[PDB]
Amino acid sequence: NKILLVDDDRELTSLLKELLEMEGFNVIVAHDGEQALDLLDDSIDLLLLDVMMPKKNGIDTLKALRQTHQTPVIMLTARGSELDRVLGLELGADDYLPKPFNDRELVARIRAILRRSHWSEQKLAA
Ligand SMILES: [Mg+2]
């Protein structure tokens, strides 16, 4: 499974890339919304997307990517109010996990959405 990490915090993306690779995932990193849209293609199984970023924020990235891709999206951001969470989900995100986050919960939420993608793939092939 291929994950596209989108966050301007280079310290967080390096830490998360290492954590997720250790959990068996293939991770590619984007540091803004424009780079994310450049790297988003059919090979991506899931996006981890931040909100507050320079050039193009996560909400605008989500709106743009949803015009062409149905790729699973988990918002992963310091914008964790109940409002922020509802907004993200309604704009097209599958899940919303505020920062600070628990490593194990992040990995389990990634695995839960990719398990649903696998169920859909099995059904589609049949
Ligand atoms: Mg942030």
Curated annotation (Swiss-Prot):
A GO CC annotation recorded here is: protein-DNA complex
Record keywords, A-Z: Activator, Cell adhesion, Cytoplasm, DNA-binding, Phosphoprotein, Stress response, Transcription, Transcription regulation, Two-component regulatory system
Task: Give the activity regulation note.
Answer: The two-component system is activated by envelope stress such as overexpression of some (misfolded) periplasmic proteins. Activated by spheroplasting (which removes the periplasm) in an autoregulatory cpxA-cpxR-dependent fashion. Cpx two-component system is activated at pH 8.0; in a degP deletion mutant activation is halved. The CpxA kinase activity is inhibited by periplasmic accessory protein CpxP; proteolysis of CpxP relieves inhibition.
Is Ribonucleoprotein included in the keywords of this UniProt record? no
Induction summary: Induced about 3-fold when stationary phase cells bind to hydrophobic surfaces; requires direct contact with hydrophobic surfaces for up-regulation of Cpx activity.
Give a GO molecular function annotation for the protein. Answer: DNA-binding transcription factor activity
Domain (Response regulatory): residue spans on this chain: 2-114
Signal peptide extent: none
The alphabetized list of GO BP terms reads: cell adhesion; negative regulation of DNA-templated transcription; positive regulation of DNA-templated transcription; regulation of cell-substrate adhesion; regulation of DNA-templated transcription
Q: Which residues carry this modification: 4-aspartylphosphate?
A: D50
What results from gene inactivation? Loss of the Cpx envelope stress response. A double cpxR-cpxA mutant decreases transcription of degP. Cells are less sensitive to killing by nalidixic acid; double cpxR-srkA disruption mutants are as sensitive to killing as single srkA mutants, suggesting the SrkA protein kinase is partially regulated by CpxR. Hypersensitive to alkaline pH (greater than pH 8.8). Decreased numbers of stationary phase cells bind to hydrophobic surfaces, cellular adhesion has altered dynamic properties; no induction of cpxR when cells bind to hydrophobic surfaces.
Record-annotated membrane-spanning stretches: none
Just give the chief location class: cytoplasm
What is the recorded post-translational modification?
Answer: Phosphorylated by CpxA.
User: What is the annotated localization of this protein?
Assistant: Cytoplasm
Its subunit composition reads: Interacts with cognate sensor kinase CpxA.
Role noted for this protein: Response regulator member of the two-component regulatory system CpxA/CpxR which responds to envelope stress response by activating expression of downstream genes including cpxP, degP, dsbA and ppiA. Required for efficient binding of stationary phase cells to hydrophobic surfaces, part of the process of biofilm formation. Induced upon cell surface binding, subsequently induces genes it controls (cpxP, dsbA and spy, degP is only partially induced). Binds and activates transcription from the degP promoter; binding is enhanced by phosphorylation.
Protein name, entry field: Transcriptional regulatory protein CpxR
What gene name is listed for this protein?
cpxR
